């Protein structure tokens, strides 16, 4: 009967959907750390600087 | 300039370019880097060749 064949494919459908879910989570986690670090590094880059007061010679 | 005695009638013989990476950048290999220059209807394409000896380094 059709009942047996339906159950077999059902298991396969669940496993496939889990794979595509894993890709999206892993990619978002990788891009999270890069975007956070870039923001913090740029903030330090703009604000920081050195200034010359006076120059003397002998 | 190529003339020391009188730099007025001289021309540029050497050019130096200071290069750094951008903030939060992945490493760059300079052997795969190409340099383009345009001057007086001449388009140049310069390339570095890596070597153990007799290398411009
Ligand atoms: C950097 O920039 C500078 C300035 O812009 C130059 O362009 C230089 O290029 C060099 O120029 C010199 C001088 O032109 C060249 O040396 C010369 O080589 C010649 C060889 S060649 O004939 O085959 O081409 C000659 O041997 C040159 O000698 C000449 O000049 C003698 C002096 O002339 C003066 O005479 C009276 C004063 O007494 C004055 O009224 C004049 O106005 C004139 O200045 C002369 O006796 C010779 O008969 C002949 O014509 C030679 O120049 C030599 O002298 C000069 C300097 O005294 C001139 O004022 C200088 O020291 C040179 O070092 C010297 O050899 C050289 O080839 C170029 O590279 C750029 O590098
Ligand atoms: C582009 O145009 C330039 C015009 O400004 C120039 O023509 C360039 O050509 C270069 O010419 C210079 C000479 O002006 C040469 O430099 C000298 O090279 C020798 C090499 S050697 O094999 O012949 O021995 C040497 O490295 C000389 O350095 C000496 O002097 C320094 C500083 O005093 C010191 O560390 C050592 O004592 C060393 O022996 C160098 O000549 C330089 O020094 C002199 C005097 O101080 C010497 O008493 C002048 O100040 C000179 O301007 C200096 O360059 C280059 O070989 C050549 O590429 C052209 O590319
Ligand atoms: C540009 O981007 C590239 C990716 O697209 C790559 O990342 C480049 O980096 C290069 O990577 C290759 C590895 O594939 C390496 O080159 C190899 O270097 C060693 C020598 S070692 O001293 O670095 O350990 C290896 O022996 C090969 O060198 C041979 O060939 C050169 C001529 O180019 C010669 O001067 C040497 O004496 C030596 O014979 C070289 O690998 C290349 O050659 C092989 C075979 O022919 C070997 O028999 C393959 O054809 C391969 O595709 C070649 O890469 C370097 O680490 C680095 O330059 C980056 O520049």
PDB file of C-alpha atoms and ligand atoms in Angstrom:
ATOM      1  CA  UNK A   1       0.000   0.000   0.000  1.00  0.00           C
ATOM      2  CA  UNK A   2       0.898   3.703  -0.356  1.00  0.00           C
ATOM      3  CA  UNK A   3       1.140   4.013   3.455  1.00  0.00           C
ATOM      4  CA  UNK A   4       4.529   2.245   3.649  1.00  0.00           C
ATOM      5  CA  UNK A   5       6.164   4.317   0.878  1.00  0.00           C
ATOM      6  CA  UNK A   6       4.900   7.623   2.332  1.00  0.00           C
ATOM      7  CA  UNK A   7       6.618   7.026   5.699  1.00  0.00           C
ATOM      8  CA  UNK A   8      10.017   6.192   4.135  1.00  0.00           C
ATOM      9  CA  UNK A   9      10.158   9.417   2.072  1.00  0.00           C
ATOM     10  CA  UNK A  10       8.869  11.400   5.093  1.00  0.00           C
ATOM     11  CA  UNK A  11      12.020  10.517   7.088  1.00  0.00           C
ATOM     12  CA  UNK A  12      14.210  11.649   4.157  1.00  0.00           C
ATOM     13  CA  UNK A  13      12.313  14.962   3.825  1.00  0.00           C
ATOM     14  CA  UNK A  14      12.924  15.820   7.503  1.00  0.00           C
ATOM     15  CA  UNK A  15      16.673  15.088   7.260  1.00  0.00           C
ATOM     16  CA  UNK A  16      17.094  17.245   4.120  1.00  0.00           C
ATOM     17  CA  UNK A  17      15.329  20.235   5.735  1.00  0.00           C
ATOM     18  CA  UNK A  18      17.706  20.010   8.726  1.00  0.00           C
ATOM     19  CA  UNK A  19      20.747  20.340   6.418  1.00  0.00           C
ATOM     20  CA  UNK A  20      19.580  23.631   4.843  1.00  0.00           C
ATOM     21  CA  UNK A  21      18.772  24.963   8.336  1.00  0.00           C
ATOM     22  CA  UNK A  22      22.345  24.243   9.506  1.00  0.00           C
ATOM     23  CA  UNK A  23      23.892  26.178   6.582  1.00  0.00           C
ATOM     24  CA  UNK A  24      21.965  29.388   7.375  1.00  0.00           C
ATOM     25  CA  UNK A  25      22.849  29.320  11.100  1.00  0.00           C
ATOM     26  CA  UNK A  26      26.565  28.575  10.534  1.00  0.00           C
ATOM     27  CA  UNK A  27      26.937  31.338   7.910  1.00  0.00           C
ATOM     28  CA  UNK A  28      25.203  33.945  10.110  1.00  0.00           C
ATOM     29  CA  UNK A  29      27.469  33.036  13.052  1.00  0.00           C
ATOM     30  CA  UNK A  30      30.599  33.481  10.902  1.00  0.00           C
ATOM     31  CA  UNK A  31      29.467  36.884   9.568  1.00  0.00           C
ATOM     32  CA  UNK A  32      28.513  38.004  13.105  1.00  0.00           C
ATOM     33  CA  UNK A  33      32.090  38.065  14.444  1.00  0.00           C
ATOM     34  CA  UNK A  34      33.530  39.811  11.360  1.00  0.00           C
ATOM     35  CA  UNK A  35      30.928  42.617  11.386  1.00  0.00           C
ATOM     36  CA  UNK A  36      31.366  43.209  15.142  1.00  0.00           C
ATOM     37  CA  UNK A  37      35.183  43.374  14.945  1.00  0.00           C
ATOM     38  CA  UNK A  38      35.168  45.696  11.897  1.00  0.00           C
ATOM     39  CA  UNK A  39      32.958  48.243  13.701  1.00  0.00           C
ATOM     40  CA  UNK A  40      35.135  48.342  16.840  1.00  0.00           C
ATOM     41  CA  UNK A  41      38.425  48.582  14.903  1.00  0.00           C
ATOM     42  CA  UNK A  42      37.175  51.488  12.749  1.00  0.00           C
ATOM     43  CA  UNK A  43      35.979  53.431  15.825  1.00  0.00           C
ATOM     44  CA  UNK A  44      39.504  53.181  17.285  1.00  0.00           C
ATOM     45  CA  UNK A  45      41.035  54.065  13.891  1.00  0.00           C
ATOM     46  CA  UNK A  46      39.216  57.406  13.494  1.00  0.00           C
ATOM     47  CA  UNK A  47      39.501  58.635  17.103  1.00  0.00           C
ATOM     48  CA  UNK A  48      43.217  57.888  17.635  1.00  0.00           C
ATOM     49  CA  UNK A  49      45.912  60.368  16.552  1.00  0.00           C
ATOM     50  CA  UNK A  50      49.187  62.091  17.498  1.00  0.00           C
ATOM     51  CA  UNK A  51      49.880  65.844  17.621  1.00  0.00           C
ATOM     52  CA  UNK A  52      53.152  67.812  17.558  1.00  0.00           C
ATOM     53  CA  UNK A  53      53.414  70.602  20.149  1.00  0.00           C
ATOM     54  CA  UNK A  54      56.750  72.362  19.508  1.00  0.00           C
ATOM     55  CA  UNK A  55      60.150  71.686  17.902  1.00  0.00           C
ATOM     56  CA  UNK A  56      63.464  72.993  19.288  1.00  0.00           C
ATOM     57  CA  UNK A  57      67.007  72.853  17.870  1.00  0.00           C
ATOM     58  CA  UNK A  58      70.538  73.227  19.274  1.00  0.00           C
TER      59      UNK A  58
ATOM     60  CA  UNK B   1      65.136  64.111  -9.702  1.00  0.00           C
ATOM     61  CA  UNK B   2      67.981  62.857 -11.917  1.00  0.00           C
ATOM     62  CA  UNK B   3      69.957  66.132 -11.831  1.00  0.00           C
ATOM     63  CA  UNK B   4      71.651  67.174  -8.574  1.00  0.00           C
ATOM     64  CA  UNK B   5      73.607  70.201  -9.859  1.00  0.00           C
ATOM     65  CA  UNK B   6      70.529  71.865 -11.395  1.00  0.00           C
ATOM     66  CA  UNK B   7      67.159  70.156 -10.588  1.00  0.00           C
ATOM     67  CA  UNK B   8      65.279  72.653 -12.794  1.00  0.00           C
ATOM     68  CA  UNK B   9      66.267  70.902 -16.044  1.00  0.00           C
ATOM     69  CA  UNK B  10      65.904  67.406 -14.549  1.00  0.00           C
ATOM     70  CA  UNK B  11      63.404  64.525 -14.684  1.00  0.00           C
ATOM     71  CA  UNK B  12      62.165  61.858 -12.249  1.00  0.00           C
ATOM     72  CA  UNK B  13      64.247  58.663 -12.400  1.00  0.00           C
ATOM     73  CA  UNK B  14      62.806  56.873  -9.337  1.00  0.00           C
ATOM     74  CA  UNK B  15      59.380  56.794  -7.642  1.00  0.00           C
ATOM     75  CA  UNK B  16      58.475  55.393  -4.201  1.00  0.00           C
ATOM     76  CA  UNK B  17      54.945  54.403  -3.116  1.00  0.00           C
ATOM     77  CA  UNK B  18      53.983  53.692   0.517  1.00  0.00           C
ATOM     78  CA  UNK B  19      51.391  50.898   0.812  1.00  0.00           C
ATOM     79  CA  UNK B  20      49.495  49.489   3.819  1.00  0.00           C
ATOM     80  CA  UNK B  21      46.508  47.170   4.332  1.00  0.00           C
ATOM     81  CA  UNK B  22      43.017  48.395   5.256  1.00  0.00           C
ATOM     82  CA  UNK B  23      41.563  47.911   8.758  1.00  0.00           C
ATOM     83  CA  UNK B  24      40.251  44.384   9.389  1.00  0.00           C
ATOM     84  CA  UNK B  25      41.659  42.906   6.166  1.00  0.00           C
ATOM     85  CA  UNK B  26      42.779  39.391   5.206  1.00  0.00           C
ATOM     86  CA  UNK B  27      46.489  38.905   4.199  1.00  0.00           C
ATOM     87  CA  UNK B  28      47.532  39.843   0.647  1.00  0.00           C
ATOM     88  CA  UNK B  29      50.285  38.159  -1.384  1.00  0.00           C
ATOM     89  CA  UNK B  30      52.221  40.770  -3.383  1.00  0.00           C
ATOM     90  CA  UNK B  31      53.303  38.201  -6.007  1.00  0.00           C
ATOM     91  CA  UNK B  32      49.728  38.088  -7.363  1.00  0.00           C
ATOM     92  CA  UNK B  33      49.496  41.906  -7.341  1.00  0.00           C
ATOM     93  CA  UNK B  34      49.529  43.857 -10.623  1.00  0.00           C
ATOM     94  CA  UNK B  35      50.358  47.575 -10.871  1.00  0.00           C
ATOM     95  CA  UNK B  36      48.900  49.769 -13.634  1.00  0.00           C
ATOM     96  CA  UNK B  37      50.215  53.211 -14.658  1.00  0.00           C
ATOM     97  CA  UNK B  38      49.155  55.671 -17.379  1.00  0.00           C
ATOM     98  CA  UNK B  39      51.486  58.431 -18.616  1.00  0.00           C
ATOM     99  CA  UNK B  40      51.538  60.341 -21.937  1.00  0.00           C
ATOM    100  CA  UNK B  41      49.695  57.685 -23.969  1.00  0.00           C
ATOM    101  CA  UNK B  42      51.493  54.692 -22.426  1.00  0.00           C
ATOM    102  CA  UNK B  43      49.668  52.123 -20.278  1.00  0.00           C
ATOM    103  CA  UNK B  44      52.096  50.047 -18.195  1.00  0.00           C
ATOM    104  CA  UNK B  45      51.490  46.775 -16.331  1.00  0.00           C
ATOM    105  CA  UNK B  46      54.184  45.910 -13.775  1.00  0.00           C
ATOM    106  CA  UNK B  47      54.627  42.596 -11.940  1.00  0.00           C
ATOM    107  CA  UNK B  48      56.895  41.233  -9.184  1.00  0.00           C
ATOM    108  CA  UNK B  49      58.656  37.885  -9.695  1.00  0.00           C
ATOM    109  CA  UNK B  50      59.535  35.877  -6.513  1.00  0.00           C
ATOM    110  CA  UNK B  51      63.005  34.295  -6.294  1.00  0.00           C
ATOM    111  CA  UNK B  52      65.484  32.984  -3.706  1.00  0.00           C
ATOM    112  CA  UNK B  53      68.392  34.911  -5.272  1.00  0.00           C
ATOM    113  CA  UNK B  54      68.557  37.891  -7.678  1.00  0.00           C
ATOM    114  CA  UNK B  55      65.147  39.161  -6.521  1.00  0.00           C
ATOM    115  CA  UNK B  56      64.206  42.849  -6.251  1.00  0.00           C
ATOM    116  CA  UNK B  57      63.722  42.712  -2.471  1.00  0.00           C
TER     117      UNK B  57
HETATM  118  C1  LIG C   1      72.300  68.825 -15.139  1.00  0.00           C
HETATM  119  O1  LIG C   1      71.903  70.168 -15.472  1.00  0.00           O
HETATM  120  C2  LIG C   1      72.970  71.009 -15.938  1.00  0.00           C
HETATM  121  C3  LIG C   1      72.513  72.466 -16.052  1.00  0.00           C
HETATM  122  O2  LIG C   1      71.238  72.548 -16.701  1.00  0.00           O
HETATM  123  C4  LIG C   1      73.519  70.444 -17.255  1.00  0.00           C
HETATM  124  O3  LIG C   1      72.528  70.493 -18.292  1.00  0.00           O
HETATM  125  C5  LIG C   1      74.001  68.994 -17.055  1.00  0.00           C
HETATM  126  O4  LIG C   1      74.355  68.383 -18.312  1.00  0.00           O
HETATM  127  C6  LIG C   1      75.777  68.444 -18.555  1.00  0.00           C
HETATM  128  O5  LIG C   1      76.169  69.685 -19.157  1.00  0.00           O
HETATM  129  C7  LIG C   1      77.582  69.880 -19.316  1.00  0.00           C
HETATM  130  C8  LIG C   1      77.786  71.311 -19.815  1.00  0.00           C
HETATM  131  O6  LIG C   1      76.974  71.577 -20.968  1.00  0.00           O
HETATM  132  C9  LIG C   1      78.190  68.792 -20.231  1.00  0.00           C
HETATM  133  O7  LIG C   1      79.633  68.796 -20.196  1.00  0.00           O
HETATM  134  C10 LIG C   1      80.186  69.209 -21.471  1.00  0.00           C
HETATM  135  O8  LIG C   1      80.599  68.149 -22.351  1.00  0.00           O
HETATM  136  C11 LIG C   1      80.909  68.602 -23.687  1.00  0.00           C
HETATM  137  C12 LIG C   1      81.268  67.408 -24.576  1.00  0.00           C
HETATM  138  S1  LIG C   1      80.573  67.521 -26.087  1.00  0.00           S
HETATM  139  O9  LIG C   1      81.090  68.705 -26.811  1.00  0.00           O
HETATM  140  O10 LIG C   1      80.908  66.304 -26.859  1.00  0.00           O
HETATM  141  O11 LIG C   1      79.099  67.620 -25.971  1.00  0.00           O
HETATM  142  C13 LIG C   1      81.996  69.701 -23.677  1.00  0.00           C
HETATM  143  O12 LIG C   1      83.297  69.163 -23.385  1.00  0.00           O
HETATM  144  C14 LIG C   1      81.646  70.813 -22.666  1.00  0.00           C
HETATM  145  O13 LIG C   1      82.682  71.815 -22.603  1.00  0.00           O
HETATM  146  C15 LIG C   1      82.236  73.030 -23.259  1.00  0.00           C
HETATM  147  O14 LIG C   1      82.212  74.194 -22.408  1.00  0.00           O
HETATM  148  C16 LIG C   1      83.471  74.815 -22.066  1.00  0.00           C
HETATM  149  C17 LIG C   1      83.180  76.092 -21.275  1.00  0.00           C
HETATM  150  O15 LIG C   1      82.262  76.930 -21.994  1.00  0.00           O
HETATM  151  C18 LIG C   1      82.072  78.170 -21.286  1.00  0.00           C
HETATM  152  O16 LIG C   1      83.009  79.190 -21.702  1.00  0.00           O
HETATM  153  C19 LIG C   1      82.856  80.548 -21.221  1.00  0.00           C
HETATM  154  C20 LIG C   1      83.603  80.751 -19.901  1.00  0.00           C
HETATM  155  O17 LIG C   1      84.986  80.425 -20.082  1.00  0.00           O
HETATM  156  C21 LIG C   1      81.390  80.998 -21.103  1.00  0.00           C
HETATM  157  O18 LIG C   1      81.256  82.324 -21.629  1.00  0.00           O
HETATM  158  C22 LIG C   1      80.426  80.058 -21.834  1.00  0.00           C
HETATM  159  O19 LIG C   1      79.074  80.487 -21.621  1.00  0.00           O
HETATM  160  C23 LIG C   1      80.599  78.589 -21.416  1.00  0.00           C
HETATM  161  O20 LIG C   1      79.932  78.341 -20.171  1.00  0.00           O
HETATM  162  C24 LIG C   1      84.345  75.101 -23.301  1.00  0.00           C
HETATM  163  O21 LIG C   1      85.683  75.420 -22.896  1.00  0.00           O
HETATM  164  C25 LIG C   1      84.398  73.915 -24.276  1.00  0.00           C
HETATM  165  O22 LIG C   1      85.007  74.333 -25.504  1.00  0.00           O
HETATM  166  C26 LIG C   1      83.022  73.294 -24.556  1.00  0.00           C
HETATM  167  O23 LIG C   1      82.248  74.139 -25.418  1.00  0.00           O
HETATM  168  C27 LIG C   1      81.348  70.196 -21.289  1.00  0.00           C
HETATM  169  O24 LIG C   1      81.028  71.152 -20.262  1.00  0.00           O
HETATM  170  C28 LIG C   1      82.040  71.296 -19.226  1.00  0.00           C
HETATM  171  O25 LIG C   1      81.945  72.586 -18.587  1.00  0.00           O
HETATM  172  C29 LIG C   1      80.749  72.800 -17.797  1.00  0.00           C
HETATM  173  C30 LIG C   1      80.660  74.246 -17.300  1.00  0.00           C
HETATM  174  O26 LIG C   1      81.930  74.679 -16.794  1.00  0.00           O
HETATM  175  C31 LIG C   1      80.207  75.188 -18.410  1.00  0.00           C
HETATM  176  O27 LIG C   1      79.796  76.436 -17.839  1.00  0.00           O
HETATM  177  C32 LIG C   1      80.637  71.766 -16.658  1.00  0.00           C
HETATM  178  O28 LIG C   1      81.607  72.010 -15.627  1.00  0.00           O
HETATM  179  C33 LIG C   1      80.803  70.340 -17.207  1.00  0.00           C
HETATM  180  O29 LIG C   1      80.898  69.400 -16.130  1.00  0.00           O
HETATM  181  C34 LIG C   1      82.039  70.221 -18.111  1.00  0.00           C
HETATM  182  O30 LIG C   1      82.181  68.876 -18.596  1.00  0.00           O
HETATM  183  C35 LIG C   1      77.708  67.381 -19.838  1.00  0.00           C
HETATM  184  O31 LIG C   1      77.967  66.481 -20.922  1.00  0.00           O
HETATM  185  C36 LIG C   1      76.223  67.282 -19.449  1.00  0.00           C
HETATM  186  O32 LIG C   1      75.990  66.044 -18.770  1.00  0.00           O
HETATM  187  C37 LIG C   1      72.962  68.116 -16.333  1.00  0.00           C
HETATM  188  O33 LIG C   1      73.592  66.911 -15.882  1.00  0.00           O
HETATM  189  C1  LIG C   2      68.742  59.019 -10.148  1.00  0.00           C
HETATM  190  O1  LIG C   2      69.199  60.386 -10.093  1.00  0.00           O
HETATM  191  C2  LIG C   2      70.091  60.701  -9.010  1.00  0.00           C
HETATM  192  C3  LIG C   2      70.391  62.197  -8.962  1.00  0.00           C
HETATM  193  O2  LIG C   2      70.221  62.679  -7.623  1.00  0.00           O
HETATM  194  C4  LIG C   2      71.373  59.870  -9.135  1.00  0.00           C
HETATM  195  O3  LIG C   2      72.128  60.230 -10.303  1.00  0.00           O
HETATM  196  C5  LIG C   2      71.033  58.368  -9.174  1.00  0.00           C
HETATM  197  O4  LIG C   2      72.204  57.575  -9.454  1.00  0.00           O
HETATM  198  C6  LIG C   2      72.938  57.300  -8.242  1.00  0.00           C
HETATM  199  O5  LIG C   2      74.071  58.158  -8.080  1.00  0.00           O
HETATM  200  C7  LIG C   2      74.639  58.115  -6.764  1.00  0.00           C
HETATM  201  C8  LIG C   2      75.770  59.138  -6.696  1.00  0.00           C
HETATM  202  O6  LIG C   2      75.215  60.458  -6.677  1.00  0.00           O
HETATM  203  C9  LIG C   2      75.121  56.700  -6.387  1.00  0.00           C
HETATM  204  O7  LIG C   2      75.213  56.610  -4.951  1.00  0.00           O
HETATM  205  C10 LIG C   2      76.508  56.159  -4.483  1.00  0.00           C
HETATM  206  O8  LIG C   2      76.684  54.743  -4.704  1.00  0.00           O
HETATM  207  C11 LIG C   2      77.847  54.139  -4.117  1.00  0.00           C
HETATM  208  C12 LIG C   2      77.934  52.678  -4.567  1.00  0.00           C
HETATM  209  S1  LIG C   2      79.460  52.247  -5.083  1.00  0.00           S
HETATM  210  O9  LIG C   2      79.436  50.831  -5.516  1.00  0.00           O
HETATM  211  O10 LIG C   2      79.872  53.096  -6.225  1.00  0.00           O
HETATM  212  O11 LIG C   2      80.433  52.400  -3.975  1.00  0.00           O
HETATM  213  C13 LIG C   2      77.749  54.278  -2.594  1.00  0.00           C
HETATM  214  O12 LIG C   2      76.599  53.570  -2.097  1.00  0.00           O
HETATM  215  C14 LIG C   2      77.662  55.759  -2.179  1.00  0.00           C
HETATM  216  O13 LIG C   2      77.296  55.820  -0.785  1.00  0.00           O
HETATM  217  C15 LIG C   2      78.371  56.303   0.053  1.00  0.00           C
HETATM  218  O14 LIG C   2      78.026  57.508   0.765  1.00  0.00           O
HETATM  219  C16 LIG C   2      77.145  57.346   1.895  1.00  0.00           C
HETATM  220  C17 LIG C   2      76.764  58.711   2.469  1.00  0.00           C
HETATM  221  O15 LIG C   2      77.916  59.555   2.587  1.00  0.00           O
HETATM  222  C18 LIG C   2      77.758  56.437   2.974  1.00  0.00           C
HETATM  223  O16 LIG C   2      76.747  55.553   3.474  1.00  0.00           O
HETATM  224  C19 LIG C   2      78.953  55.610   2.474  1.00  0.00           C
HETATM  225  O17 LIG C   2      80.159  56.351   2.702  1.00  0.00           O
HETATM  226  C20 LIG C   2      78.855  55.187   0.998  1.00  0.00           C
HETATM  227  O18 LIG C   2      80.120  54.691   0.539  1.00  0.00           O
HETATM  228  C21 LIG C   2      76.662  56.600  -3.010  1.00  0.00           C
HETATM  229  O19 LIG C   2      77.023  58.001  -3.019  1.00  0.00           O
HETATM  230  C22 LIG C   2      76.327  58.800  -2.022  1.00  0.00           C
HETATM  231  O20 LIG C   2      77.226  59.587  -1.212  1.00  0.00           O
HETATM  232  C23 LIG C   2      77.878  60.686  -1.887  1.00  0.00           C
HETATM  233  C24 LIG C   2      78.929  61.353  -0.997  1.00  0.00           C
HETATM  234  O21 LIG C   2      78.412  61.546   0.327  1.00  0.00           O
HETATM  235  C25 LIG C   2      80.205  60.517  -0.934  1.00  0.00           C
HETATM  236  O22 LIG C   2      81.166  61.161  -0.088  1.00  0.00           O
HETATM  237  C26 LIG C   2      76.834  61.682  -2.427  1.00  0.00           C
HETATM  238  O23 LIG C   2      76.173  62.375  -1.357  1.00  0.00           O
HETATM  239  C27 LIG C   2      75.800  60.951  -3.296  1.00  0.00           C
HETATM  240  O24 LIG C   2      74.733  61.841  -3.648  1.00  0.00           O
HETATM  241  C28 LIG C   2      75.224  59.701  -2.612  1.00  0.00           C
HETATM  242  O25 LIG C   2      74.394  58.976  -3.529  1.00  0.00           O
HETATM  243  C29 LIG C   2      74.208  55.561  -6.899  1.00  0.00           C
HETATM  244  O26 LIG C   2      75.011  54.394  -7.113  1.00  0.00           O
HETATM  245  C30 LIG C   2      73.410  55.847  -8.182  1.00  0.00           C
HETATM  246  O27 LIG C   2      72.272  54.982  -8.238  1.00  0.00           O
HETATM  247  C31 LIG C   2      69.933  58.043 -10.201  1.00  0.00           C
HETATM  248  O28 LIG C   2      69.470  56.706  -9.986  1.00  0.00           O
HETATM  249  C1  LIG C   3      48.815  33.358  -6.187  1.00  0.00           C
HETATM  250  O1  LIG C   3      47.584  32.644  -5.967  1.00  0.00           O
HETATM  251  C2  LIG C   3      47.682  31.219  -6.127  1.00  0.00           C
HETATM  252  C3  LIG C   3      46.295  30.584  -6.068  1.00  0.00           C
HETATM  253  O2  LIG C   3      45.580  30.887  -7.272  1.00  0.00           O
HETATM  254  C4  LIG C   3      48.650  30.650  -5.080  1.00  0.00           C
HETATM  255  O3  LIG C   3      48.133  30.811  -3.749  1.00  0.00           O
HETATM  256  C5  LIG C   3      50.023  31.339  -5.198  1.00  0.00           C
HETATM  257  O4  LIG C   3      50.892  30.946  -4.124  1.00  0.00           O
HETATM  258  C6  LIG C   3      51.804  29.929  -4.584  1.00  0.00           C
HETATM  259  O5  LIG C   3      51.336  28.609  -4.277  1.00  0.00           O
HETATM  260  C7  LIG C   3      52.096  27.571  -4.909  1.00  0.00           C
HETATM  261  C8  LIG C   3      51.476  26.220  -4.576  1.00  0.00           C
HETATM  262  O6  LIG C   3      50.624  25.806  -5.651  1.00  0.00           O
HETATM  263  C9  LIG C   3      53.575  27.614  -4.492  1.00  0.00           C
HETATM  264  O7  LIG C   3      54.413  27.476  -5.654  1.00  0.00           O
HETATM  265  C10 LIG C   3      55.216  26.279  -5.565  1.00  0.00           C
HETATM  266  O8  LIG C   3      56.427  26.490  -4.822  1.00  0.00           O
HETATM  267  C11 LIG C   3      57.201  25.318  -4.495  1.00  0.00           C
HETATM  268  C12 LIG C   3      58.623  25.782  -4.159  1.00  0.00           C
HETATM  269  S1  LIG C   3      58.741  26.429  -2.627  1.00  0.00           S
HETATM  270  O9  LIG C   3      60.134  26.875  -2.404  1.00  0.00           O
HETATM  271  O10 LIG C   3      57.844  27.598  -2.479  1.00  0.00           O
HETATM  272  O11 LIG C   3      58.394  25.410  -1.610  1.00  0.00           O
HETATM  273  C13 LIG C   3      57.133  24.263  -5.626  1.00  0.00           C
HETATM  274  O12 LIG C   3      58.332  23.478  -5.730  1.00  0.00           O
HETATM  275  C14 LIG C   3      56.784  24.864  -7.001  1.00  0.00           C
HETATM  276  O13 LIG C   3      57.877  25.667  -7.482  1.00  0.00           O
HETATM  277  C15 LIG C   3      58.401  25.162  -8.733  1.00  0.00           C
HETATM  278  O14 LIG C   3      58.100  25.999  -9.867  1.00  0.00           O
HETATM  279  C16 LIG C   3      58.759  27.281  -9.924  1.00  0.00           C
HETATM  280  C17 LIG C   3      58.323  27.994 -11.201  1.00  0.00           C
HETATM  281  O15 LIG C   3      57.147  28.769 -10.940  1.00  0.00           O
HETATM  282  C18 LIG C   3      60.288  27.138  -9.845  1.00  0.00           C
HETATM  283  O16 LIG C   3      60.899  28.420  -9.652  1.00  0.00           O
HETATM  284  C19 LIG C   3      60.719  26.214  -8.696  1.00  0.00           C
HETATM  285  O17 LIG C   3      62.120  25.918  -8.803  1.00  0.00           O
HETATM  286  C20 LIG C   3      59.910  24.907  -8.619  1.00  0.00           C
HETATM  287  O18 LIG C   3      60.319  23.999  -9.651  1.00  0.00           O
HETATM  288  C21 LIG C   3      55.500  25.720  -6.969  1.00  0.00           C
HETATM  289  O19 LIG C   3      54.359  24.974  -7.432  1.00  0.00           O
HETATM  290  C22 LIG C   3      54.103  25.238  -8.835  1.00  0.00           C
HETATM  291  O20 LIG C   3      54.578  24.188  -9.701  1.00  0.00           O
HETATM  292  C23 LIG C   3      53.828  22.957  -9.632  1.00  0.00           C
HETATM  293  C24 LIG C   3      54.553  21.818 -10.358  1.00  0.00           C
HETATM  294  O21 LIG C   3      54.978  22.254 -11.656  1.00  0.00           O
HETATM  295  C25 LIG C   3      55.757  21.322  -9.563  1.00  0.00           C
HETATM  296  O22 LIG C   3      56.428  20.285 -10.291  1.00  0.00           O
HETATM  297  C26 LIG C   3      52.385  23.198 -10.105  1.00  0.00           C
HETATM  298  O23 LIG C   3      52.354  23.557 -11.493  1.00  0.00           O
HETATM  299  C27 LIG C   3      51.740  24.305  -9.256  1.00  0.00           C
HETATM  300  O24 LIG C   3      50.473  24.677  -9.817  1.00  0.00           O
HETATM  301  C28 LIG C   3      52.621  25.559  -9.109  1.00  0.00           C
HETATM  302  O25 LIG C   3      52.091  26.398  -8.075  1.00  0.00           O
HETATM  303  C29 LIG C   3      53.983  28.876  -3.698  1.00  0.00           C
HETATM  304  O26 LIG C   3      53.850  28.603  -2.298  1.00  0.00           O
HETATM  305  C30 LIG C   3      53.215  30.167  -4.029  1.00  0.00           C
HETATM  306  O27 LIG C   3      53.973  30.934  -4.973  1.00  0.00           O
HETATM  307  C31 LIG C   3      49.922  32.874  -5.239  1.00  0.00           C
HETATM  308  O28 LIG C   3      51.179  33.423  -5.651  1.00  0.00           O
END
